[PDB]
Design a protein around this ligand. Structure first.
Ligand SMILES: Nc1ncnc2c1ncn2[C@@H]1O[C@H](CSCC[C@H](N)C(=O)O)[C@@H](O)[C@H]1O
Lengths: 385, 166, 408
């Protein structure tokens, strides 16, 4: 019992869906009724790798064996649905919570916050923020981080720096997040003076080491073979709190690097993240489908992934090269057509490879390119500013 | 349904049925995820291929997992899928699992006579005469009629085993 | 408020039966250009068990033993009558219709027999659809040498029997039964087209009988019938029973299965008709191209064992196709679509070749029928037979196309 739960929790934290699945089958093969905690662990393990259907199947099987859902199971469900931007599943689970009578803690509120942020619903995000402040409870660092990310995404510099100066007044040792999307938002409007004034304080960082390393390497001082090793050890050290934090860290870093003119550095960061285990759904290569998944990424992370995906396509044939802009219930609707992810990907492909990547006549959240259009096709110039 | 979508579905279904025919459920899962990425909704046919691939190499838990994916995906499982599941349960001797699958078939407005006969015959073949007798008697008391060959087989096997009551 | 807001049969037809203990419940007799038929005069509510529709007493029938020796029930033939000598010389196996024709003529000559009156509602020589009355021109339109040869053999046998047994020297009581050959031919045709065979118990004697049952030959044939015949031995009554739990709407025709598991050719040989939804029709394929039986059944929702195919566009034609199409089965092996498309293309090519073998098409046959004004019943029967074969092949083609469509 203890060994099964420990292994399953470790796999879920580390995003090892396959190992958790194998443990589940082995322990079910011995006529052992699974507990709620182990089922929650395997569900959250499946959600790390964006395997929503497997997590939903496990959640459905949870009630079959008599294991009732707990608060941790719901927290994992909201976090997994929020990472992918599936806000419809988010409000469905919220309705399930409201009809189950369980009180909503900060986890539900902030999971909804980033679920609407990744889905592009900025107005609903701020509405849910004001509702969170209306009722009760104190937002943690995660809530203000999510609102800073949503403000940076929706071209709001002024509220961004207001929240920045408000949050740093609490002596909280601001994390990699805040700096990363602050560089991103300042690079949105070519605020080179603000970027430099942030970097001047960022470079020293007498307190922590991670900030110093990343601030040195973003400027290009750590690009050498020996000078990238410090970045590699700091990345390895950071790969211990879990893939849930790793995906956010890589998203923020990629957005900052892409929006600061460091396209080659962003490409190399994405390349080193792929072998780590973060973004396991990023690339699929087979005779049938050559796909890139971006529904869990930010705008900056999408552009870096698309840039390196286009370059690999020109090197080489699959029956179809597709872009998974939106994944979830929104696919069978016109709502995903207007989504910021879909329109951003479409505009990027349109201005880079001309009118070759068309939409899908059956799916509302995919960008399509037949093999015939692949036949007629270094495409994206990756340079450091 | 355009001709392009039809051709893509044809190619994907062909390759998936191939992978199911070489006893490779993992490959069928890769094809299903390829359909998901491509935007093609997984219909009952591809999932039935997955279930058959799991059942061919004597894997009951994987077959039931594929049926759970059926029900979660919202698709109506084909009669062949349920027939394969009941045949696998009978081959493994899982009489209760076969009865549950028969009840699920009944709930889905399906004729369960053929599946009942297949389950009884498989249970007899694998040498599970007690469970075969129980399933046969449940079906017969339920108003279901068996073939003459099955009646003769049940009578002869029961009398050979010395079971006069059944 | 009440103030603010096919033809019926001759009443004497049922009245002569009614005064002789014939009872019809919830049904009325109607007559049309094709012929007589039985239709529900109201809405028959489906009950727990089978519902009684008609009751025909045994004394109004003309029944003969199906096996040697020949004994008639009820015994209408007197001892020493030469008609018994004529009957007793027939072949026990294949000459069953000749004995029934002899009995029919004898009954028509009997003054107190019921069939002297009921025989006036039988179809005449120009209204009967039996192929025994068809000429060589009508047989030429069957487009089937086997059926034509069988019909010629039947006609030759009937005429040989009449010539052998109705020569010059026969007594007057025999000569008046059939003065000339076509009368006996019509008698044999009526016997073939309306005989009902059953295993009936009379008292303590159980035997098979060939029966000419009035008011029960009125029912039309169907391969999915709503009625069936049950013999009640205690009072010697034949019951027409509607299927248990099967609702029947007002005006719905009452139909029984004349004979199960028989193709259209044997139906045309015996009852002189064919149906386009015959679920037992056979098309001879090469067998080189085959499709998946399980997928074909599941797409069209055809369940049950091969001898009890049934549907939950799909009709008896699809069942006949599934029973006749070249099929392969490997327990649980799925079919890869690519070979299925090629197989159905080859099968469609074979079906189109078969259609091209026929000099004309089915739509032109229907147009010829609609423009027909001076043709005998057998002419239209042959035209309908060939057209029904053409529609069966076309339905096979369409079913293959839609099956290959729904394979993904
Ligand atoms: N389903 C059907 N379609 C067309 N003709 C049918 C038929 N079923 C039976 N018949 C015809 O009806 C005859 C059986 S006696 C049935 C009643 C007859 N039509 C009459 O008016 O007296 C057979 O000779 C057959 O040719």
């Amino acid at each position: 019992m203890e060994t099964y739960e420990g292994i399953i929790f470790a796999c879920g934290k580390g995003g090892l869906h396959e190992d958790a699945r194998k443990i589940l089958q082995y322990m079910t093969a011995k006529d052992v009724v699974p507990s709620s905690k182990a089922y929650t662990g395997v569900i959250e393990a499946f959600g790390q790798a964006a395997l929503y259907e497997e997590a939903l199947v496990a959640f459905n099987t949870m009630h079959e064996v008599g294991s009732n859902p707990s608060i941790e199971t719901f927290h994992s469900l909201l976090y997994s649905f929020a990472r992918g931007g599936l806000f419809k599943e988010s409000e469905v689970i919220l309705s399930r919570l409201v009809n189950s009578g369980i009180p909503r803690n900060r986890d539900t509120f902030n999971a909804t916050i980033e679920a609407y942020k990744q889905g592009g619903k900025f107005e609903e995000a701020v509405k849910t923020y004001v509702d969170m402040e209306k009722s009760r409870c104190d937002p943690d660092e995660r809530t203000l981080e999510a609102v800073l990310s949503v403000y940076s995404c929706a071209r709001l510099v002024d509220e961004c720096r207001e929240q920045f100066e408000e949050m740093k007044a609490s002596d909280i040792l601001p994390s990699i997040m805040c700096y990363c999307m602050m560089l991103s938002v300042y690079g949105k409007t070519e605020s080179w003076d603000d970027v430099n004034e942030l970097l001047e304080e960022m470079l020293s960082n007498r307190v922590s080491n991670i900030h110093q390393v990343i601030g040195q390497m973003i400027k290009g001082n750590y690009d050498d073979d020996s000078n990238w090793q410090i970045v590699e050890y700091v990345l390895d050290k950071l790969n211990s709190e879990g893939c849930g934090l790793g995906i956010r860290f890589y998203n923020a870093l990629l957005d900052a690097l892409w929006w600061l003119g460091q396209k080659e550095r962003a490409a190399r960061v994405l390349n080193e993240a792929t072998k780590r285990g973060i973004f396991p759904e990023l690339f699929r290569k087979n005779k049938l489908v050559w796909s890139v998944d971006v529904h869990r990424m930010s705008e900056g992370g999408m552009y870096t992934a698309l840039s390196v995906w286009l370059n690999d396509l020109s090197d080489i044939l699959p029956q179809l090269a597709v872009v998974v802009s939106v994944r979830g219930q929104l696919e069978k609707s016109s709502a995903a057509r207007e989504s910021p992810i879909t329109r951003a990907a479409f505009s990027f492909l349109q201005d880079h490879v001309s009118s070759s990547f068309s939409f899908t006549g059956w799916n509302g959240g995919r960008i399509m390119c037949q093999r015939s259009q692949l036949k007629q096709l270094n495409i994206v110039a990756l340079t450091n500013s | 349904v355009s001709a392009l979508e039809r051709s893509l579905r044809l190619t994907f279904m062909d390759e998936l049925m191939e992978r199911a025919r070489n006893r490779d459920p993992s490959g069928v899962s890769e094809v299903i995820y390829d359909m998901i990425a491509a935007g093609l909704s997984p219909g009952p046919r591809s999932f039935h291929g997955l279930v058959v691939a799991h059942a061919l190499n004597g894997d009951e838990q994987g077959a039931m997992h594929s049926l759970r994916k059926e029900l979660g995906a919202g698709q109506r499982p084909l009669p062949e899928t349920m027939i394969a599941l009941v045949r696998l349960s009978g081959s493994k001797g899982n009489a209760q699992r076969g009865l549950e699958l028969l009840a699920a078939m009944e709930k889905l407005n399906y004729d369960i006579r053929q599946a009942w006969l297949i389950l009884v015959e498989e249970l007899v073949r694998t040498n599970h005469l007690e469970e075969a007798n129980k399933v046969f008697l449940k079906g017969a008391r339920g108003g279901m009629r068996a073939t003459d060959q099955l009646y003769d087989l049940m009578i002869e096997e029961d009398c050979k085993a010395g079971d006069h009551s059944n | 408020f009440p103030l603010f807001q096919l033809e019926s049969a001759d009443p004497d037809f049922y009245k002569i039966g009614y005064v002789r203990r014939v009872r019809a419940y919830g049904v009325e007799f109607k007559e049309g250009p094709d012929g007589f038929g039985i239709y529900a005069s109201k809405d028959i509510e489906p009950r727990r068990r089978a519902r009684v529709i008609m009751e025909i007493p045994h004394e109004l029938m003309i029944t003969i033993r199906q096996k040697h020796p020949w004994m008639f029930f009820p015994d209408i033939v007197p001892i020493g009558h030469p008609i018994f000598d004529i009957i007793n010389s027939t072949d026990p196996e294949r000459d069953w219709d000749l004995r029934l024709a002899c009995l029919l003529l004898f009954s028509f000559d009997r003054e107190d027999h019921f069939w002297r009156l009921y025989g006036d509602f039988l179809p005449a020589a120009d209204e009967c659809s039996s192929l025994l009355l068809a000429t060589e021109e009508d047989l030429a339109e069957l487009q089937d040498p086997q059926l034509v040869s069988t019909i010629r053999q039947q006609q030759k046998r009937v005429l040989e029997f009449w010539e052998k047994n109705w020569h010059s020297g026969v007594p007057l009581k025999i000569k008046r039964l059939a003065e000339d050959a076509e009368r006996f031919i019509w008698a044999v045709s009526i016997a073939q087209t309306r005989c009902i065979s059953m295993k009936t118990r009379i008292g303590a004697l159980v035997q098979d009988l060939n029966m000419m049952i009035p008011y029960a030959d009125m029912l039309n044939h169907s391969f999915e019938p709503n009625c069936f015949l049950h013999w009640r031995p205690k009072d010697r009554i034949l019951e027409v029973m509607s299927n248990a739990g099967q609702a029947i709407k007002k005006g719905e025709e009452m139909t029984i299965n004349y004979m199960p598991g028989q193709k259209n050719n044997m139906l045309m040989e015996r009852y002189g008709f064919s149906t386009p939804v015959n679920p037992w029709d056979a098309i001879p394929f090469s067998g080189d191209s085959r499709i998946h039986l399980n997928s074909f059944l599941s797409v069209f929702n055809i369940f049950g064992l091969p001898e009890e195919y049934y549907h939950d566009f799909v009709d008896g034609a699809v069942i006949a196709a599934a029973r006749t199409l070249p099929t392969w089965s490997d327990i649980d092996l799925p079919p890869i679509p690519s070979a299925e498309r090629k197989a159905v293309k080859e099968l469609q090519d074979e079906c189109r070749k078969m259609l091209a073998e026929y000099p004309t098409t089915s739509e032109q046959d229907q147009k010829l029928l609609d423009s027909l004004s001076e043709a005998r019943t057998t002419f239209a029967t042959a035209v309908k037979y060939r057209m029904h074969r053409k529609m069966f092949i076309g339905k096979i083609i369409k079913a293959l196309d839609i099956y290959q469509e729904r394979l993904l």
